[PDB]
Amino acid sequence: DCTMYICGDSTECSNLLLQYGSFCTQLNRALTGIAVEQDKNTQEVFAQVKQIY
Amino acid sequence: PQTLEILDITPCSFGGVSVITPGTNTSNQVAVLYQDVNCTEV
Numbered sequence A: 001d002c003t004m005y006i007c008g009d010s011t012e013c014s015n016l017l018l019q020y021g022s023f024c025t026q027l028n029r030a031l032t033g034i035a036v037e038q039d040k041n042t043q044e045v046f047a048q049v050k051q052i053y
Numbered sequence B: 001p002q003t004l005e006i007l008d009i010t011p012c013s014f015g016g017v018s019v020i021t022p023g024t025n026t027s028n029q030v031a032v033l034y035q036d037v038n039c040t041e042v
């Protein structure tokens, strides 16, 4: 959480961070892209077959 | 400073929150996954 990590529990700081805009969103877009592919990495390795033998 | 005691300051605003939803074109109903918590705050 890039609003929480930068400005802890602070309204005055969080209002200043919102002037920086998409920075907080683009970091999580890359971390989510990792979180999605890490479940995809596990999906590609351990499940190659539809049937559980 | 008045009576002598040691108070830990624990930050508020704790635990992850996720949004489980179908596309807004489908429905506006959402499920909210609260990580790191039991069912209490809501």
Ligand SMILES: *[C@@H]1O[C@H](CO)[C@@H](O)[C@H](O)[C@H]1NC(C)=O
Binding pocket: B002, B003
């Ligand atoms: C200050 O307040 C504390 C309680 O918070 C009390 O124990 C202490 O005696 C007070 N000191 C004076 C002299 O006001």
Ligand SMILES: *[C@@H]1O[C@H](CO)[C@@H](O)[C@H](O)[C@H]1NC(C)=O
Binding pocket: B025
């Ligand atoms: C919303 O769903 C309808 C019905 O399936 C579809 O015709 C339309 O293209 C969708 N619009 C958007 C913005 O996804």
Ligand SMILES: *[C@@H]1O[C@H](CO)[C@@H](O)[C@H](O)[C@H]1NC(C)=O
Binding pocket: B037, B038, B039
């Ligand atoms: C929540 O607490 C109950 C006991 O009150 C426990 O059985 C349950 O597993 C807990 N759930 C979580 C959040 O792990």
